[PDB]
Each structure stands twice: as C-alpha cells, then as structure tokens.
C-alpha cells in the first residue's frame with residue numbers, strides 16, 4: 305500500500321508540473337529580475353542627462369573640445385550614476401540569493417542526507433525523506449512525507465490502577481473502545497492488551513488525576529499456574 | 531519584527547512637484563523614476579509576503595471549546611476575549627507599549643490587525659487542544675494533561691514526573707504567565723526591537739522630507755520661486771541642480787530601504803522558522819526556543835511583529 | 843458599483859457580504875475576484891473554514907490510516 309501511494313504521488317507531481325507552470329515562479333522571478341535590470345542599464349544609454357545628444361561621437365563632432373568636455377562630463381556623470389545603481393541592485397540581490405542558497409544547502413544536508421525532525425522544515429507533515437532534482441539556476445526538492453489520515457474518537461486516561469499502583473504506558477497511550485482498554489502507539493491505532501510489559505508502574509492510586517481502574521495482564525501468570 | 535510599513539514614493543511629485551518644466555527636465559535622466567518605484571513596490575509587496583509566511587501557517591481557524599478543563603492550567607491571559615478588537619490581554623499590553631505632501635503614500639498592510647489576531651488565536655487554540663498534530667495534518671484533540679505528558683517525555687523525563695506533580699506544574703505555569711503580564715505592563719524596554727524598526731523608518735522619512743529644504747548649491751530651495759525669480763535660460767541650470775540633489779537623496783533613501791527590508795525579511799524568515807518549529811511542534815535545538823529544555827510555545831501578535839512565550 | 847474601502851475608492855466592483863479566499867489582494871483585508879453574467883466582486887477575505895475540535899478531558903483522537911504525500915519545494 306505504501307508503495308502504491310508513493311508511486312501515485314510521484315505521478316501526481318509529474319502531472320502538476322507538466323500542466324501548470326506557476327509553481328516555478330521563484331526561479332523565473334530571479335531570471336526576469338536580472339533581465340529587467342540589464343535592460344534598464346542598457347536603455348539608460350539612450351538618455352541625455354541634460355546634454356546635447358545621447359551619442360558620444362555625435363557630441364565630439366558637433367562641437368569643440370572646450371564644450372564637448374562639458375557635455376561629455378554630463379554624460380559620464382549620468383552613466384556612472386546609472387552603473388552604480390545597477391551594481392548596488394546586483395549586490396543586494398546577490399546577498400538575497402546567497403541567503404536562499406545557504407538555506408538550500410541546509411535543506412539538502414538535513415533533508416536529503418538525513419531525516420529531520422524540524423516541523424514544516426521538510427514539507428507539511430512528518431518527514432520521511434527527500435530527493436533533489438536540478439533546475440536551471442536552482443534546486444527542487446521532493447519532500448516525501450507521512451501524513452496521518454483518518455482518526456477515531458477514543459476515550460483515554462492518563463494511567464490505570466490494577467493492584468493499588470499506578471501504571472503508565474511505556475511508549476504509547478491508553479485508549480478504550482468503551483468496552484475494554486488497550487495501549488496503542490500515538491500515531492497509528494494498533495491496540496494491544498495492557499500487559500505488565502507495555503507499561504511500567506509507579507506510585508499508588510492516590511496522586512494521579514483521572515486514573516481509571518482496570519486489570520493489567522501479566523505474562524508470567526500462565527507459566528506460573530502451569 | 532516581521533514587517534516594515536509599506537511605503538511608496540512617487541518620484542515625480544517628489545522631485546518636481548507641480549512644475550511641468552521640471553518634469554520635462556527630469557525626463558532627460560531616463561528611467562530612474564521607474565526604477566525607484568519598482569524597488570519600493572518590491573519592498574511593499576515583500577512585507578505582505580512576510581506576514582503571510584509568519585502567521586498564515588494554519589489551514590483552518592481553530593477555536594477553543596467554551597469550557598476550560600485544561601488539567602489546571604490557565605490560558606485566560608492569552609486566549610482572546612470578546613469584550614473588545616477581538617484580541618487577548620497580553621496582545622493588548624503589547625499593542626499599547628508601542629507608539630505627507632510629496633507622494634509619500636503609506637499603503638495599508640494586507641492583513642489587518644484583527645485578522646492577525648485571528649491567526650494567532652487559531653494557532654494558540656490548535657496547540658492547546660491538539661498538541662503538535664495540527665501542524666502535521668488533521669488536528670487530533672487530546673487532553674492537555676496528556677499533551678504535557680508527551681512534551682515532558684520528549685525531553686527525557688518520564689511521564690509519572692508530570693502526572694504526580696500536575697498541580698504543582700499548573701501553579702508554576704500560571705504564576706509564570708502572571709509574571710510575564712507584570713513584566714510587560716511595568717517596563718517597556720523589552721519591546722525595543724519593534725520600536726527600533728518603527729523609529730528607524732520614521733527617521734528615514736523625516737530625513738527624506740527635510741532634504742526638500744536644501745539648495746544643493748542653487749538659489750532657493752523652492753521650485754516655483756526659481757521659476758519666477760529668473761528666466762528659463764537660467765532656471766534650467768538652477769532646476770537641474772535641484773533635480774540632481776533631490777534625486778541623489780531619493781536614491782539614498784531607497785537604498786536604505788532595500789537594505790533594511792532585506793534585514794527585516796531575515797527576521798521574518800527566522801520568525802517563521804521559530805513558529806513552525808517552536809509552536810507547531812516541540813524542538814530539541816538548544817537555546818533556539820528560550821533558555822532551557824523546551825516544552826512548547828504560544829505566539830502573540832504585536833504591531834508589525836510577533837512575540838513568543840517559550841514555555842520551557 | 844462604487845465601494846469605499848479602508849484602502850481607497852474601489853470603482854467597478856460589487857461589495858458582497860460573502861467571504862472567499864483572497865484572489866487579488868487590495869488592502870486592509872479586502873480582496874477582489876471575478877465571479878458570478880459574472881462580474882468583479884470585492885469581499886473581506888476569509889482566513890479558512892472555522893473548526894471546533896471536540897476537546898474534552900478524556901477524549902483522544904488517534905489515526906488508523908496514513909497517506910504518503912509528496913510535496914515540492916523550489917529554491
């Protein structure tokens with residue numbers, strides 16, 4: 305059953321990617337931002353900044369150096385300011401991309417090379433593993449996670465008394481279908497008889513709040529009787 | 531801190547307010563306005579993205595049951611009460627401890643404070659009634675005493691330690707919440723982090739505006755005054771000086787905003803991580819969730835930011 | 843036909859009493875979307891279907907089945 309669910313889920317990923325493309329907005333946004341930065345940088349070349357003509361050779365020809373100097377100096381100031389603005393945009397955007405790259409490195413080291421227990425760090429749900437896939441200027445993870453599905457409203461109790469002593473479940477929780485009592489692991493209903501092995505004793509009936517009487521079976525009574 | 535104030539600045543009405551000659555001069559500098567406007571809009575949207583990532587992590591909007599059988603713990607100082615702004619008490623203490631002519635529009639945040647309060651009440655009700663499970667899938671209710679049993683057993687302390695000391699732990703937790711209430715209500719230098727962001731942006735705006743009253747080497751800092759006092763064959767030069775000056779001031783402000791917004795986004799991603807790992811579950815990263823072994827946490831909104839109560 | 847929001851003056855969208863997920867953000871919590879002959883409506887976005895967990899002092903809900911989702915994360 306797990307195999308079939310995992311295969312079908314991979315298939316749904318295949319389809320989701322193949323049909324809609326707004327899932328890859330993150331990479332496309334970086335590419336478009338840099339393309340527009342370059343296009344603005346270039347289109348700044350066609351501006352006068354208060355000079356005569358946006359072409360350099362044209363100013364060198366149309367005038368004399370005693371004024372081509374001033375016109376040029378204006379163009380140089382303008383283009384230099386535009387260039388610094390572009391480089392500052394690039395510095396900031398590169399700091400941000402380095403942030404996402406360190407984050408991806410962490411996510412691959414903790415989420416592929418091992419199984420993590422950081423909630424929602426590796427896809428919504430309990431984390432099982434992940435597989436990376438390349439993508440143009442970036443990475444794409446497939447967080448294979450485990451999600452509990454369909455529950456039941458059981459009745460519980462923090463401990464049970466059998467012989468005056470309190471009994472707490474070793475690794476599980478005490479549930480009851482209204483008729484009997486069982487101890488079951490927290491994440492998957494799999495009831496078990498409450499032996500003296502599933503539980504461990506402590507104190508007496510007095511102190512815990514909400515305890516319920518019951519009979520904790522003991523595996524030694526059969527052999528001891530026989 | 532989670533978000534700045536979404537500010538937008540019309541380049542033109544700033545640099546060349548109501549002077550056609552000035553606008554037509556500015557057009558010679560090219561696409562600087564388009565660039566600055568696009569940058570400030572990028573920031574102004576990243577803010578709403580930040581708040582979205584920090585708070586909107588719950589799929590539904592849970593609600594505590596009306597009765598309050600929580601094994602003896604008392605959450606009335608953090609759960610909402612309908613008697614106000616449907617916020618809670620400590621959210622109020624937080625909201626009280628924190629205290630236009632030139633295109634300086636201040637857009638409103640997409641999530642209004644009531645909706646932020648509803649998100650945080652949802653996360654709080656989920657953590658109270660369902661443990662961490664509401665962050666892994668469908669919320670599964672479980673008596674609070676047992677949830678603290680699991681939280682203990684998670685840090686290497688068997689359950690009977692909790693069950694035998696339930697009343698003592700309840701009293702300690704209630705009294706600690708009370709001390710938080712007092713600590714916030716009396717001193718206010720605990721909220722220095724949010725107030726510092728607000729003041730930094732206020733001073734940035736005030737410097738931007740007070741740059742309007744500078745000559746940059748021109749005749750008079752007023753535009754119409756230069757247009758009147760002289761002729762275009764010299765008003766052009768005087769203006770061009772004013773435009774260069776105001777444009778430089780505007781770029782400096784927008785660069786300050788870009789950097790400060792990168793920093794606030796750093797703190798917002800950190801808050802998102804801290805809420806996903808520290809509320810929606812119990813962490814084992816030392817000192818990541820308050821000094822000590824970590825038991826759980828409850829978030830509380832605050833003007834442009836979040837405030838956790840790491841119960842450890 | 844002419845709505846007045848805490849963001850500004852919306853022109854050309856009906857103001858509904860309903861509440862759906864935010865499709866196009868506006869501000870101050872208002873979100874607009876194109877829906878049913880149809881038109882553009884501007885509502886106050888809803889945060890999700892409210893839900894009251896049947897909490898008690900002795901009721902626990904345990905799963906019986908599981909599903910293996912496979913999500914994607916792009917960086």
Ligand SMILES: *[C@@H]1O[C@H](CO)[C@@H](O[C@@H]2O[C@H](CO)[C@@H](O[C@@H]3O[C@H](CO)[C@@H](O)[C@H](O)[C@@H]3O)[C@H](O)[C@H]2NC(C)=O)[C@H](O)[C@H]1NC(C)=O
Nearest residue numbers: 305306307308309310311312452453454906907908909910
């Ligand atoms: C736990 O959940 C899984 C969910 O996949 C359950 O398995 C699925 O159960 C449904 C309902 O019976 C199956 O659908 C039916 O499949 C049969 C196969 O011949 C078909 O005749 C029906 O028309 C319908 O499609 C589905 O196949 C099945 N999935 C797998 C992979 O077996 C599973 O039963 C649940 N566990 C428990 C204990 O309920």
Ligand SMILES: *[C@@H]1O[C@H](CO)[C@@H](O[C@@H]2O[C@H](CO)[C@@H](O[C@@H]3O[C@H](CO)[C@@H](O)[C@H](O)[C@@H]3O)[C@H](O)[C@H]2NC(C)=O)[C@H](O)[C@H]1NC(C)=O
Nearest residue numbers: 602691692694695696697698699700701702703704705706
């Ligand atoms: C573990 O530490 C806790 C710390 O709270 C201990 O509980 C506290 O113990 C002090 C000392 O006895 C109590 O103070 C006294 O309370 C009585 C109550 O009537 C009063 O008559 C005295 O004047 C004094 O105030 C305090 O109440 C108590 N706190 C609680 C919540 O019970 C606890 O005893 C320690 N455990 C062990 C095993 O020592």
Ligand SMILES: *[C@@H]1O[C@H](CO[C@@H]2O[C@@H](C)[C@@H](O)[C@@H](O)[C@@H]2O)[C@@H](O[C@@H]2O[C@H](CO)[C@@H](O)[C@H](O)[C@H]2NC(C)=O)[C@H](O)[C@H]1NC(C)=O
Nearest residue numbers: 461464465466467468469509510513514515516517518519
């Ligand atoms: C849980 O059981 C205790 C005691 O259990 C009794 O003694 C056991 C050895 C076994 O024979 C059980 O069937 C008995 O019920 C109960 O404590 C008693 O409560 C009664 C009041 O009904 C009181 O008269 C007795 O003195 C108490 N003590 C004993 C030793 O009987 C307790 O009430 C039970 N609780 C629940 C929720 O069932």
Ligand SMILES: *[C@@H]1O[C@H](CO)[C@@H](O[C@@H]2O[C@H](CO)[C@@H](O)[C@H](O)[C@H]2NC(C)=O)[C@H](O)[C@H]1NC(C)=O
Nearest residue numbers: 598602603604605606607608619704707708711
């Ligand atoms: C939980 O704590 C609140 C206070 O945070 C308690 O409310 C107090 O109740 C007493 C008795 O009714 C009053 O004297 C106080 O004035 C109340 N204070 C406030 C701030 O309301 C409440 O009793 C505690 N217990 C429960 C079960 O809610």
Ligand SMILES: *[C@@H]1O[C@H](CO)[C@@H](O)[C@H](O)[C@H]1NC(C)=O
Nearest residue numbers: 461513514515599898899900
């Ligand atoms: C739960 O609350 C009901 C309400 O009266 C009470 O009768 C019962 O004893 C309580 N049980 C526990 C374990 O708190």
